[PDB]
Design a protein around this ligand. Structure first.
Ligand SMILES: [K+]
Ligand SMILES: [K+]
Ligand SMILES: [K+]
Ligand SMILES: [K+]
Ligand SMILES: [K+]
Ligand SMILES: [K+]
Ligand SMILES: [K+]
Ligand SMILES: [K+]
Ligand SMILES: [K+]
Ligand SMILES: [K+]
Ligand SMILES: [K+]
Ligand SMILES: [K+]
Ligand SMILES: [K+]
Ligand SMILES: [K+]
Ligand SMILES: [K+]
Ligand SMILES: [K+]
Ligand SMILES: [K+]
Ligand SMILES: [K+]
Ligand SMILES: [K+]
Ligand SMILES: [K+]
Ligand SMILES: [K+]
Ligand SMILES: [K+]
Ligand SMILES: [K+]
Ligand SMILES: [K+]
Ligand SMILES: [K+]
Ligand SMILES: [K+]
Ligand SMILES: [K+]
Ligand SMILES: [K+]
Ligand SMILES: [K+]
Ligand SMILES: [K+]
Ligand SMILES: [K+]
Ligand SMILES: [K+]
Ligand SMILES: [K+]
Ligand SMILES: [K+]
Ligand SMILES: [K+]
Ligand SMILES: [K+]
Ligand SMILES: [K+]
Ligand SMILES: [K+]
Ligand SMILES: [K+]
Ligand SMILES: [K+]
Ligand SMILES: [K+]
Ligand SMILES: [K+]
Ligand SMILES: [K+]
Ligand SMILES: [K+]
Ligand SMILES: [K+]
Ligand SMILES: [K+]
Ligand SMILES: [K+]
Ligand SMILES: [K+]
Ligand SMILES: [K+]
Ligand SMILES: [K+]
Ligand SMILES: [K+]
Ligand SMILES: [K+]
Ligand SMILES: [K+]
Ligand SMILES: [K+]
Ligand SMILES: [K+]
Ligand SMILES: [K+]
Ligand SMILES: [K+]
Ligand SMILES: [K+]
Ligand SMILES: [K+]
Ligand SMILES: [K+]
Ligand SMILES: [K+]
Ligand SMILES: [K+]
Ligand SMILES: [K+]
Ligand SMILES: [K+]
Ligand SMILES: [Mg+2]
Ligand SMILES: [Mg+2]
Ligand SMILES: [Mg+2]
Ligand SMILES: [Mg+2]
Ligand SMILES: [Mg+2]
Ligand SMILES: [Mg+2]
Ligand SMILES: [Mg+2]
Ligand SMILES: [Mg+2]
Ligand SMILES: [Mg+2]
Ligand SMILES: [Mg+2]
Ligand SMILES: [Mg+2]
Ligand SMILES: [Mg+2]
Ligand SMILES: [Mg+2]
Ligand SMILES: [Mg+2]
Ligand SMILES: [Mg+2]
Ligand SMILES: [Mg+2]
Ligand SMILES: [Mg+2]
Ligand SMILES: [Mg+2]
Ligand SMILES: [Mg+2]
Ligand SMILES: [Mg+2]
Ligand SMILES: [Mg+2]
Ligand SMILES: [Mg+2]
Ligand SMILES: [Mg+2]
Ligand SMILES: [Mg+2]
Ligand SMILES: [Mg+2]
Ligand SMILES: [Mg+2]
Ligand SMILES: [Mg+2]
Ligand SMILES: [Mg+2]
Ligand SMILES: [Mg+2]
Ligand SMILES: [Mg+2]
Ligand SMILES: [Mg+2]
Ligand SMILES: [Mg+2]
Ligand SMILES: [Mg+2]
Ligand SMILES: [Mg+2]
Ligand SMILES: [Mg+2]
Ligand SMILES: [Mg+2]
Ligand SMILES: [Mg+2]
Ligand SMILES: [Mg+2]
Ligand SMILES: [Mg+2]
Ligand SMILES: [Mg+2]
Ligand SMILES: [Mg+2]
Ligand SMILES: [Mg+2]
Ligand SMILES: [Mg+2]
Ligand SMILES: [Mg+2]
Ligand SMILES: [Mg+2]
Ligand SMILES: [Mg+2]
Ligand SMILES: [Mg+2]
Ligand SMILES: [Mg+2]
Ligand SMILES: [Mg+2]
Ligand SMILES: [Mg+2]
Ligand SMILES: [Mg+2]
Ligand SMILES: [Mg+2]
Ligand SMILES: [Mg+2]
Ligand SMILES: [Mg+2]
Ligand SMILES: [Mg+2]
Ligand SMILES: [Mg+2]
Ligand SMILES: [Mg+2]
Ligand SMILES: [Mg+2]
Ligand SMILES: [Mg+2]
Ligand SMILES: [Mg+2]
Ligand SMILES: [Mg+2]
Ligand SMILES: [Mg+2]
Ligand SMILES: [Mg+2]
Ligand SMILES: [Mg+2]
Ligand SMILES: [Mg+2]
Ligand SMILES: [Mg+2]
Ligand SMILES: [Mg+2]
Ligand SMILES: [Mg+2]
Ligand SMILES: [Mg+2]
Ligand SMILES: [Mg+2]
Ligand SMILES: [Mg+2]
Ligand SMILES: [Mg+2]
Ligand SMILES: [Mg+2]
Ligand SMILES: [Mg+2]
Ligand SMILES: [Mg+2]
Ligand SMILES: [Mg+2]
Ligand SMILES: [Mg+2]
Ligand SMILES: [Mg+2]
Ligand SMILES: [Mg+2]
Ligand SMILES: [Mg+2]
Ligand SMILES: [Mg+2]
Ligand SMILES: [Mg+2]
Ligand SMILES: [Mg+2]
Ligand SMILES: [Mg+2]
Ligand SMILES: [Mg+2]
Ligand SMILES: [Mg+2]
Ligand SMILES: [Mg+2]
Ligand SMILES: [Mg+2]
Lengths: 209, 148
RNA sequence: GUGGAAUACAAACCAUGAAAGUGUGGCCUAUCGAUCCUUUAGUCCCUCGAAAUUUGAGGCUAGAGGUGCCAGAAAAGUUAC
RNA sequence: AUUAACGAGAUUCCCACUGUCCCUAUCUACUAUCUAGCGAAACCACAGCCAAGGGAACGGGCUUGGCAAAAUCAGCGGGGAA
RNA sequence: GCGAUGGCCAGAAAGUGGUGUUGACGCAAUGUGAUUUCUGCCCAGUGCUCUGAAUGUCAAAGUGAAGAAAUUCAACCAAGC
RNA sequence: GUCCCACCCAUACCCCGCCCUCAGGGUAGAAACGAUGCCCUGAGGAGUAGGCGGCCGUGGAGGUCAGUGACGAAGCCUAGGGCGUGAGCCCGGGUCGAACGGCCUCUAGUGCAGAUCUUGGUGGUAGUAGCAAAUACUUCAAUGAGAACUUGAAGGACCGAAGUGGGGAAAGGUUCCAUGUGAACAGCGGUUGGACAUGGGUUAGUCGAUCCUAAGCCAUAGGGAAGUUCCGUUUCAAAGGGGC
RNA sequence: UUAACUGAACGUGGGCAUUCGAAUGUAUCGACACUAGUGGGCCAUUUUUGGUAAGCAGAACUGGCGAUGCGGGAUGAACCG
RNA sequence: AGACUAAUCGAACCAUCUAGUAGCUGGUUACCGCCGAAGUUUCCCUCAGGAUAGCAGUGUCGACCUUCAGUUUUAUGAGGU
RNA sequence: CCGGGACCGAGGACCGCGCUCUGCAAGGAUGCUGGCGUAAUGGUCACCAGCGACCCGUCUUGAAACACGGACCAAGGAGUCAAGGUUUUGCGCGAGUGUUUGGGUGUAAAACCCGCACGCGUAAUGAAAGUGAACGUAGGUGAGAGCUUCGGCGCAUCAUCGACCGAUCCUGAUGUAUUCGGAUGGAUUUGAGUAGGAGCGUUAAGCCUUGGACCCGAAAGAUGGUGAACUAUGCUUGGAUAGG
RNA sequence: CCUAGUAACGGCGAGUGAAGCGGCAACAGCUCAAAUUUGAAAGCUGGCUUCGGCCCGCGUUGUAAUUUGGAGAGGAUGCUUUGGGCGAGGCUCCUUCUGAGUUCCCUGGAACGGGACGCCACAGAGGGUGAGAGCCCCGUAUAGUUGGAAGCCAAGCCUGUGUAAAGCUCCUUCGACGAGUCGAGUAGUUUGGGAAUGCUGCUCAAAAUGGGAGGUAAAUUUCUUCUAAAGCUAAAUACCGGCCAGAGACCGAUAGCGCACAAGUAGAGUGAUCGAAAGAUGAAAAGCACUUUGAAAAGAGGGUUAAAUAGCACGUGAAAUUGUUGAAAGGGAAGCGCUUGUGACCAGACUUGCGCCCGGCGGAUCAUCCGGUGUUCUCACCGGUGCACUCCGCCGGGCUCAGGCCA
């Protein structure tokens, strides 16, 4: 029933909801369990970082396409441009994704530079310590200060473009001919009439001869 | 807390404040929104007019990301400049440069125009613009341009 | 002071009378019908969400098909077991 | 529609018979009754003498009158709207 | 009512069952209720049963025509009524 | 019937005291005040259903009284006292034996006469209703603290061979026998008992079971069913036993 | 709107308590928010409808009982104080 | 005979769905202080029930707004008992 | 202007109004005297006496009712918790607000620290394509607390006339992909709009809805199992019933 | 977590209701069919076996190597890549060892209580011992220490070597890719899925730049994105059923599980099934020796104990109901309100206090001044002086004032 001025209620409590109720009294306990696992995992990968290298990628809709984030893995064309064989890459801490493509030059150039920055900071220990190979670090450079995150050392430096800048006066540009508002109205109008105008031109030319 | 309750005050009094003639039975009148068109019509017509019926056309599989375009008025255009730099322009100490403002980087798509603008030229980049907003920017000595 | 009938103006186009005027149905007090669905009239208008053109369907404004228990469920009896 | 025989089936009359009745009397056994031993249950707001009055229009309690003396045994079927 | 490729009945189905080690002097389904003497008239109504000449009504599938197609329109049309 | 004096008493009216509620004032160069206090002035007080305010009690939690206690904590009894309008609070006397309270905040499974309310315990009735079908008992002696219903003898009776006799089937499970015994059971009693305690007792080649088949039940070959399983019993099966 | 600055509505400036233009009271001004219970009533003077009438059935204004004790009517929800 | 199917039959017994739903009957736990009702309007398969308005409490805010009134007086209208 | 009785004594330095003015009856009682100093006054309980007094809870217009529940006592016994709304009280920040999904850290379920997204708010209106808030010191008139240089300025809020944005109905400029575009000016029309932002989080109370939903209560319905030791009907295999 | 009580479904009523994007937890990739090893079935189960193999069998209607769309096959081209064995050292599990009062007095049956004096502490968590114990006992903290077993990781060393196998850069040309399957119609069920979201039955039944999808049915023309009808795979997630462990503003024997106990027990039902009640002597049994009355059960004495007002019918021991003793009332109920009386029992209050004068007794040092120190900077304290008409205390006598109850 209803008796006063109310908002019409819709509470979905007509099933046996009390059989499926999940409280979380183990929130602090599960946090301790996760930290112990991370600490154990880091110790197993002794000098290596605890992560993999990811590429930079742009979000997909008209909302969010102004921002960039990290993706799944590097493409096969990016790896070839840097000069890293595809079989070697996943064994030195680099992720690979075989189903992403480079439709532009902007994304390709950004990720190629990312790979060769990483390759310059890499230290390779030989498979057998008494017989080093010419592609390994010659062990005088094996001692340095290292990083073990790879998500803070190679993160997204700036996800958004700068929101403000300054130019000298008299260098400001001139507007479009009729004005910005009129340009938008004209672009919309042309799209709504592309089919009508093409048909009119076609029947005119056919009836011409 | 249970000690601040009228339940504690009713102890010792018959009927618990519910009446001797009417008795607080189980569900006199139905459950929920029952009787909306029959015996709860007086309530449903004084409040909530427009409750019953259909209006408009349908839209299968609507994606809300197609309709994203937040707007900002010219009234608050200068609040997007950092505070220290903003005071230099207003006091009249730059007089040689102009600021270039990116609306998309701040999370806006369309520029409406509601208030007034001080007479200092500015450069605005936007996806959409109102007719009045473009008039006031140009009259102050600025220009708006479209960026997608 | 929520949902048949009545009163006085405004904006158009008309009828009558020489004219002032009168006329928004029957001299006055009764003679009637929501949501959902269907069907017709209207603009020539909006949408079918990867893009166009023709069929089809869907919306926006006004009537009609009816609820006489007339603010409007779809409904036959018996029990002396 | 009739119908011999049959019926712990319903109905009317006759003979015999009788305590069914006029009209009620008497006898025997077992109880009840008293004692020793053993030993429950139903029910119970508080209780337990009436007449009238008014009152939810039939009072144990209220109002005005009648009256009214410990503790008790065998029976009884008016009331306790048992 | 029925001559076994059958009548009546059981089961979710079955290379499944009862009547049935059966065959009209038999099996199955209803009414009346020994013997005697009788058992009249009514087929309009509700049922049951028969005959197809009936084109009247008439499903899905199939056939023909129009259309760019979705589709629409026509003839033909089992049993039943 | 009419007229006239005096007198009687409501929680009503008038004057006084006290309680509460409402309204209106005063109080800092602070010798100053639970300023949420104190001082001055006026009016008002009925109440079911119902609304709001303030207070009292109970089980637990944080802080604080450097709290009480085997020289006696908590609980219980008490026509012994004091405080409060009231729910309640405090003290004396007795019993007893290991923990408990005041103040400010926090918290709740927090306050009972009723629900033919739930569980447990107990009355009147009341030493009351009753312990009356199946014909029936009497004498002497012995045992024993104690004998109508224990044993011996002698009388009197009933069942009257379709028995109150002598044996079995189903069912029970030691109820069978001997010795002994306080309570409880045998709706009276009890030295007696199908009761209570301690021991003992059931012997088969011939009596039964075991062997055979009946009405029927279930395996195998096969066919259904998502499946637990349903049908099928000689079938649309390459189905056995006898000697040297 | 009128033949018409002729009117109609809204105003500037100026004048009029030498008295702001009946009586009495003001022991309670205006506006808002949120919500409880109730939605079986009955009695009486005067006015009244149906009925032979009823401690019957139905209305209007006002006062009561319900929700309320106290002094009278011996008793007596509603009468007198 | 609606008879019998373990003291159970006009549809046995046992566990679970299940704390099945009830506009209907019964109950609902300390004290003091202040305020204090309704049985009426409209709609409803509405008549032993609801929503809606009224009657009631609590919190306030605006000024302490010459502000009001279940009343009298003076002038002036309407009515068909 | 003189007599006679009854009940009462609030207040606690002075201050005031006055008079018959060495003082007083003028803003509230003092003076003198006797007995006794304890159960004498006073209090609790029991009983007799005068007057008064129907059994509680409940439904009801009306209960002491010949209306229902209640023999007695002890212990148990009924408006709760979660999500989502709303108005009002307290608190933090304020055009913003919200650490706790997660990460860092720890004396380890506490306390402390971090910030990318996101939610609500900052802009509405149309079914939709779409468009999108200043003529003026953010307007004029009448009231209006407070301030004031005394001329005035006028918060909050109320009444009234206008201005701006979206929708609906008219009008249709310069131009031109010659069929597009929609400027400008109107209209007894309409919006949960603008017109010098108020919100976000949290704490406490009343109210609403779904849930067992203040506590106890049907006649019924559904899913899966167990019974023919009584009784009904049938099948296989056995038994029993004087004398006329 | 958010999207979102949103798009959508619904006698469009009551009601119902997802997904893409975004932030985070956790991250990991692969193998078959379709090709001739064809200069050599190069593959495998089983038996016997000096241990090296041998023998039959499976299999050409296809067992190995090679390829899986990210490709690849076939050619060029010249660089690069790999196999064994030791192994310090560390981690996990079990086990041995760990500081300080029984010091003195009082109460008590017995301190573990009160008082006095000490000590330990990376240990003052918890429990026991005749009452509240850091130091009486077990344990509690800390890194170490004696001994034993098996695994895992790993700094770094010692050794062969290209028969073979592997990666990269370019290219004319090649480039096999899953059928009663997809898809279509119709019926039923289901979903938020709307001219039909998924699943299944029946009928029809494909193709090679082909095929599916692109949330409104249909024809024509474009575009985007993947590659079905064969297969494997850790982590972040669920759960207290099983075996262990640590806890709480939870319950305290009618509560908490039906069960704190010989509880799924005793008992009921033909059966499926139903299903209770019931904790506490004392520190220690020291659980009453003996005498006497009685047939016995028992009683009376006498013992144990701090206590028998703890005796196994056992801590404390309330009410209903009952016995004895004591007080009182009663002519067809009793109980209750206001107000006297009688009898019984009882709490308070009062007992003196301040002041003045006279005498006796005792002690100081009263006022003033000097030195030191505080403090509110003008008010005090301590040391010195004072030394009898001053100051303080007690006792004796007299006087005024105030004091309890009823008139
Ligand atoms: K209420
Ligand atoms: K919009
Ligand atoms: K109706
Ligand atoms: K009508
Ligand atoms: K109606
Ligand atoms: K029926
Ligand atoms: K009948
Ligand atoms: K007969
Ligand atoms: K008798
Ligand atoms: K007797
Ligand atoms: K009478
Ligand atoms: K009386
Ligand atoms: K047959
Ligand atoms: K017949
Ligand atoms: K017959
Ligand atoms: K016959
Ligand atoms: K006959
Ligand atoms: K006929
Ligand atoms: K015929
Ligand atoms: K016929
Ligand atoms: K409390
Ligand atoms: K005591
Ligand atoms: K007796
Ligand atoms: K006898
Ligand atoms: K006999
Ligand atoms: K034998
Ligand atoms: K033999
Ligand atoms: K045997
Ligand atoms: K045998
Ligand atoms: K057989
Ligand atoms: K089978
Ligand atoms: K004019
Ligand atoms: K109301
Ligand atoms: K109401
Ligand atoms: K009534
Ligand atoms: K009446
Ligand atoms: K009276
Ligand atoms: K049974
Ligand atoms: K009803
Ligand atoms: K008239
Ligand atoms: K006074
Ligand atoms: K009642
Ligand atoms: K009663
Ligand atoms: K709030
Ligand atoms: K934000
Ligand atoms: K003013
Ligand atoms: K407008
Ligand atoms: K509720
Ligand atoms: K037989
Ligand atoms: K979104
Ligand atoms: K081979
Ligand atoms: K192979
Ligand atoms: K080692
Ligand atoms: K001692
Ligand atoms: K000692
Ligand atoms: K001590
Ligand atoms: K299909
Ligand atoms: K395609
Ligand atoms: K599509
Ligand atoms: K239990
Ligand atoms: K049993
Ligand atoms: K002691
Ligand atoms: K003793
Ligand atoms: K004791
Ligand atoms: Mg009340
Ligand atoms: Mg009630
Ligand atoms: Mg109600
Ligand atoms: Mg006209
Ligand atoms: Mg006419
Ligand atoms: Mg219509
Ligand atoms: Mg589409
Ligand atoms: Mg009488
Ligand atoms: Mg009478
Ligand atoms: Mg009576
Ligand atoms: Mg009398
Ligand atoms: Mg009798
Ligand atoms: Mg009688
Ligand atoms: Mg057809
Ligand atoms: Mg035909
Ligand atoms: Mg009152
Ligand atoms: Mg509790
Ligand atoms: Mg004590
Ligand atoms: Mg007592
Ligand atoms: Mg003890
Ligand atoms: Mg409770
Ligand atoms: Mg009770
Ligand atoms: Mg009560
Ligand atoms: Mg007797
Ligand atoms: Mg007998
Ligand atoms: Mg008898
Ligand atoms: Mg005898
Ligand atoms: Mg005989
Ligand atoms: Mg004989
Ligand atoms: Mg024997
Ligand atoms: Mg014997
Ligand atoms: Mg006996
Ligand atoms: Mg005996
Ligand atoms: Mg005996
Ligand atoms: Mg025995
Ligand atoms: Mg034999
Ligand atoms: Mg079988
Ligand atoms: Mg089979
Ligand atoms: Mg009612
Ligand atoms: Mg009447
Ligand atoms: Mg009536
Ligand atoms: Mg009432
Ligand atoms: Mg009255
Ligand atoms: Mg009276
Ligand atoms: Mg009278
Ligand atoms: Mg039976
Ligand atoms: Mg319930
Ligand atoms: Mg129930
Ligand atoms: Mg009042
Ligand atoms: Mg209706
Ligand atoms: Mg009722
Ligand atoms: Mg005002
Ligand atoms: Mg005021
Ligand atoms: Mg008239
Ligand atoms: Mg006085
Ligand atoms: Mg005296
Ligand atoms: Mg006395
Ligand atoms: Mg009386
Ligand atoms: Mg009566
Ligand atoms: Mg009743
Ligand atoms: Mg009764
Ligand atoms: Mg308890
Ligand atoms: Mg977390
Ligand atoms: Mg049904
Ligand atoms: Mg039988
Ligand atoms: Mg939202
Ligand atoms: Mg939601
Ligand atoms: Mg659903
Ligand atoms: Mg290869
Ligand atoms: Mg190759
Ligand atoms: Mg130790
Ligand atoms: Mg201890
Ligand atoms: Mg200890
Ligand atoms: Mg010690
Ligand atoms: Mg494939
Ligand atoms: Mg299904
Ligand atoms: Mg479907
Ligand atoms: Mg635990
Ligand atoms: Mg117990
Ligand atoms: Mg229990
Ligand atoms: Mg006990
Ligand atoms: Mg003894
Ligand atoms: Mg003791
Ligand atoms: Mg006892
Ligand atoms: Mg005891
Ligand atoms: Mg007693
Ligand atoms: Mg008495
Ligand atoms: Mg000195």
């Amino acid at each position: 029933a209803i008796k006063h001025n109310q908002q019409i209620p819709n509470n979905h409590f007509r099933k046996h909801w009390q059989r499926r109720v999940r409280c979380h009294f183990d929130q602090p306990g599960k946090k301790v369990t996760r930290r112990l696992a991370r600490r154990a995992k880091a110790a197993a990968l002794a000098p290596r970082p605890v992560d993999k290298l990811r590429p930079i990628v742009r979000c997909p809709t008209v909302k969010y396409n102004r921002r960039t984030r990290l993706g799944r893995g590097f493409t096969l064309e990016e790896l070839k441009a840097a000069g890293i064989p595809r079989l070697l890459a996943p064994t030195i801490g680099i992720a690979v994704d075989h189903r992403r493509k480079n439709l532009s030059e902007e994304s390709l150039a950004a990720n190629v530079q990312r790979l060769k920055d990483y390759k310059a900071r890499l230290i390779l220990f030989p498979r057998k310590s008494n017989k080093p190979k010419k592609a390994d670090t010659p062990k005088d450079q094996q001692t340095a200060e290292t990083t073990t995150s790879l998500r803070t050392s190679f993160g997204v430096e700036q996800p958004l473009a700068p929101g403000f800048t300054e130019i000298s006066k008299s260098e400001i540009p001139a507007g479009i001919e009729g004005g910005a508002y009129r340009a938008l109205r004209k672009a919309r109008s042309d799209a709504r009439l592309v089919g009508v105008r093409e048909k009119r031109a076609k029947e005119k030319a056919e009836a011409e001869a | 807390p249970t000690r601040f309750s009228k339940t504690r005050k009713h102890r010792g009094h018959v009927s618990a404040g519910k009446g001797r003639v009417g008795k607080h039975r189980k569900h006199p009148g139905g459950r929920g929104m029952a009787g909306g068109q029959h015996h709860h019509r007086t309530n449903l017509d004084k409040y909530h007019p427009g409750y019953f019926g259909k209006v408009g056309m349908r839209h299968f599989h609507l994606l809300r990301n197609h309709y994203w375009r937040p707007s900002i008025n010219i009234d608050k255009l200068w609040s997007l400049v950092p505070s220290d730099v903003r005071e230099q322009y207003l006091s009249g100490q730059k007089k040689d440069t102009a600021p270039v403002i990116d609306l998309l980087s701040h999370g806006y798509a369309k520029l409406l125009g509601k208030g007034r603008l001080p007479e200092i030229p500015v450069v605005v980049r936007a996806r959409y613009v109102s007719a009045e907003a473009e008039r006031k920017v140009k009259e102050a000595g600025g220009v708006v341009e479209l960026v997608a």
